Each structure stands twice: as structure tokens, then as C-alpha cells.
Write an enzyme that holds these catalytic residues in place. Structure first.
Site, PDB file in Angstrom:
ATOM      1  N   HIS A 164       0.835  -1.206   0.000  1.00 58.61           N
ATOM      2  CA  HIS A 164       0.000   0.000   0.000  1.00 58.61           C
ATOM      3  C   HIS A 164       0.867   1.254   0.000  1.00 58.61           C
ATOM      4  O   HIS A 164       2.070   1.173   0.231  1.00 58.61           O
ATOM      5  CB  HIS A 164      -1.016   0.013   1.149  1.00 58.61           C
ATOM      6  CG  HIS A 164      -0.415   0.160   2.510  1.00 58.61           C
ATOM      7  ND1 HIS A 164       0.394  -0.799   3.077  1.00 58.61           N
ATOM      8  CD2 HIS A 164      -0.592   1.111   3.456  1.00 58.61           C
ATOM      9  CE1 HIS A 164       0.685  -0.449   4.318  1.00 58.61           C
ATOM     10  NE2 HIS A 164       0.100   0.705   4.572  1.00 58.61           N
TER      11      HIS A 164
ATOM     12  N   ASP B 154       5.230   3.411   5.980  1.00 57.52           N
ATOM     13  CA  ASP B 154       5.731   2.142   6.504  1.00 57.52           C
ATOM     14  C   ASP B 154       5.899   1.052   5.436  1.00 57.52           C
ATOM     15  O   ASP B 154       6.508   0.008   5.693  1.00 57.52           O
ATOM     16  CB  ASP B 154       4.826   1.651   7.646  1.00 57.52           C
ATOM     17  CG  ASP B 154       3.441   1.240   7.172  1.00 57.52           C
ATOM     18  OD1 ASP B 154       2.878   1.923   6.289  1.00 57.52           O
ATOM     19  OD2 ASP B 154       2.907   0.237   7.702  1.00 57.52           O
TER      20      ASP B 154
ATOM     21  N   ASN C 162      -4.874   4.369  11.841  1.00 47.75           N
ATOM     22  CA  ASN C 162      -5.335   5.528  11.100  1.00 47.75           C
ATOM     23  C   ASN C 162      -6.461   5.100  10.174  1.00 47.75           C
ATOM     24  O   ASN C 162      -6.252   4.267   9.291  1.00 47.75           O
ATOM     25  CB  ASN C 162      -4.180   6.101  10.276  1.00 47.75           C
ATOM     26  CG  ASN C 162      -4.597   7.279   9.398  1.00 47.75           C
ATOM     27  OD1 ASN C 162      -5.649   7.261   8.753  1.00 47.75           O
ATOM     28  ND2 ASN C 162      -3.755   8.300   9.356  1.00 47.75           N
TER      29      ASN C 162
ATOM     30  N   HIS D  99      -8.106  -0.983   5.170  1.00 49.18           N
ATOM     31  CA  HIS D  99      -7.243  -0.082   5.904  1.00 49.18           C
ATOM     32  C   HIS D  99      -6.960   1.116   5.003  1.00 49.18           C
ATOM     33  O   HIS D  99      -6.914   2.254   5.463  1.00 49.18           O
ATOM     34  CB  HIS D  99      -5.947  -0.795   6.253  1.00 49.18           C
ATOM     35  CG  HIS D  99      -4.939   0.087   6.908  1.00 49.18           C
ATOM     36  ND1 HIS D  99      -5.136   0.648   8.153  1.00 49.18           N
ATOM     37  CD2 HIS D  99      -3.729   0.523   6.485  1.00 49.18           C
ATOM     38  CE1 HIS D  99      -4.092   1.391   8.466  1.00 49.18           C
ATOM     39  NE2 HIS D  99      -3.224   1.332   7.472  1.00 49.18           N
TER      40      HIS D  99
ATOM     41  N   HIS E 130       1.539   3.863   2.003  1.00 53.90           N
ATOM     42  CA  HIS E 130       1.851   4.607   3.222  1.00 53.90           C
ATOM     43  C   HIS E 130       3.338   4.427   3.532  1.00 53.90           C
ATOM     44  O   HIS E 130       3.945   3.428   3.142  1.00 53.90           O
ATOM     45  CB  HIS E 130       0.987   4.123   4.400  1.00 53.90           C
ATOM     46  CG  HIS E 130      -0.400   4.698   4.416  1.00 53.90           C
ATOM     47  ND1 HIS E 130      -1.334   4.366   5.377  1.00 53.90           N
ATOM     48  CD2 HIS E 130      -1.012   5.585   3.594  1.00 53.90           C
ATOM     49  CE1 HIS E 130      -2.457   5.021   5.145  1.00 53.90           C
ATOM     50  NE2 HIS E 130      -2.288   5.769   4.068  1.00 53.90           N
TER      51      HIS E 130
HETATM   52 ZN   LIG Z   1      -1.136   2.150   6.307  1.00 55.35          ZN
END
Ligand SMILES: [Zn+2]
EC number: 3.5.2.6
Length: 217
Positions: free
Chosen positions: A76, A80, A170, A139, A78
Site C-alpha cells: 500500500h 511504513d 489511522n 485499511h 503509506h
Molecule cells: Zn497504512
């Protein structure tokens, strides 16, 4: 067996013969990924928080296995997961991702991945088989899971919460309502699951998917 860096911010734990879990801390927050040792190089599932950690992770695994990291699957858009995209591209590492993940990456100010993964994609590296699956929004709008059919190991990413997590994280960019259906799609697709790796936290089993559905209830 677990190998770490002097600092402690980076560790790699072995799950089996050619599968290891890598964990980096972003006060500090852990994030999991996989390191796949194949006859033709190393393949990672997700990078790290940033370019410093990502480079460190790579240097660590390349040194240990005396091979180069040839591919990385981005689950994804993000930090991280796509935090070190710039490092990957300057090292000739192929950053696989769905087209959706690629556009959200650009949009989040990140250099963008290949955008080559389709809803169901099967990759083979040497003798290591890897399947990527987009179960729907959860998510994040683009989250995908990774499946190792030879071990029945599922990388859930942040679509799956760990056993002691009571917080979804989040959800500003999440689709809470759809999240449950997407998890059900994973359960329906993979009938016999052994181990399940959560976005962060300890490796568990299918019980983690049920636990996450419980949190979403
Ligand atoms: Zn994430």
C-alpha cells in the site's frame, strides 16, 4: 533465529527455510515485511518507513545472504510500506505494485512503483512462488495481501491487526465499512491458512483475521 542491527531499529526473524520477517521501528512504531531468499536473489514484501531504514534493511539482508535484492512488493501507499521507494529505484530494485497503489503514491509525494500487479498476480522467483491479491478497500483503498502457496503463509499487512491490538489505527484514509467484506474475501479465497503476518505485531494464524473482523464489528 533473529538477527538485529546494533541500534535495534531493524531485525529479521526466520519463519522457515527461505522465509524471514523483517521489522523496523519508525515513541517508536514497528512495521513488518518479509524477506524471501531465493536461488535468484532476495525478494522483499514491503520496504520500510524511510530511505535511511530501507537502505539499512537492504544492506543488512544483502550482506547476510550475499545476494542482491531484486524485487519488492509494495502492499500500500503509506510510509511504513513505500517509505524507501527512492532507495529501491536507485539500486535497480523492481518495486511492484497495483496501478492504484502507484497513483496514490505519486499523490502522496512519493516516487511511484511499477503499477504492474493485477487483482490476482502470481510471481515466481527461482523456486519461490508468490501470489498477490487485492481483496477490496479496507485499511486503505489500495491494500493488497500476499500469499506464499508453498507454505500457506499470508502477509496481511495493515488489513490485519495483531492479537493484542485493540486499535484499528489511522482510519482517515480507510474504508471501515468495506474493510470487513475485504477480509471475508481473503478468508473465502484461502481456505487452509497456516501462518498470518500482521502489518505490525507478532505472526499469528487465521485467528488474526477473525480478531480484526471483531474489532470492525
Ligand atoms: Zn497504512
Amino acid at each position: 533465529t533473529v538477527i538485529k542491527n546494533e541500534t535495534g531499529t531493524i531485525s529479521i526473524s526466520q519463519l522457515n527455510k527461505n522465509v524471514w520477517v523483517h521489522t523496523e521501528l519508525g515513541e517508536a512504531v514497528p512495521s513488518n515485511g518479509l524477506v524471501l531468499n531465493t536461488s535468484k536473489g532476495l525478494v522483499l514484501v514491503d520496504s520500510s518507513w524511510d530511505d535511511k531504514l530501507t537502505k539499512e534493511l537492504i544492506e543488512m539482508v544483502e550482506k547476510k545472504f550475499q545476494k542482491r535484492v531484486t524485487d519488492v512488493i509494495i502492499t500500500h501507499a503509506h510510509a511504513d510500506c513505500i517509505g524507501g521507494i527512492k532507495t529501491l529505484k536507485e539500486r535497480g530494485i523492481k518495486a511492484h505494485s497495483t496501478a492504484l497503489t502507484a497513483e496514490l503514491a505519486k499523490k502522496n509525494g512519493y516516487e511511484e512503483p511499477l503499477g504492474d500487479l493485477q487483482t490476482v498476480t502470481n510471481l515466481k522467483f527461482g523456486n519461490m512462488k508468490v501470489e498477490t491479491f487485492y481483496p477490496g478497500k479496507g485499511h486503505t483503498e489500495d491494500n493488497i495481501v500476499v500469499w506464499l502457496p508453498q507454505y500457506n503463509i499470508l502477509v496481511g499487512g495493515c488489513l490485519v491487526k495483531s492479537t493484542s491490538a485493540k486499535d484499528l489505527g489511522n482510519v482517515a484514509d480507510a474504508y471501515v465499512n468495506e474493510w470487513s467484506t475485504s477480509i471475508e474475501n481473503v478468508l473465502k479465497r484461502y481456505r487452509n491458512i497456516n501462518a498470518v503476518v500482521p502489518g505490525h505485531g507478532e505472526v499469528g494464524d487465521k485467528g488474526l483475521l477473525l480478531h480484526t473482523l471483531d474489532l470492525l464489528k
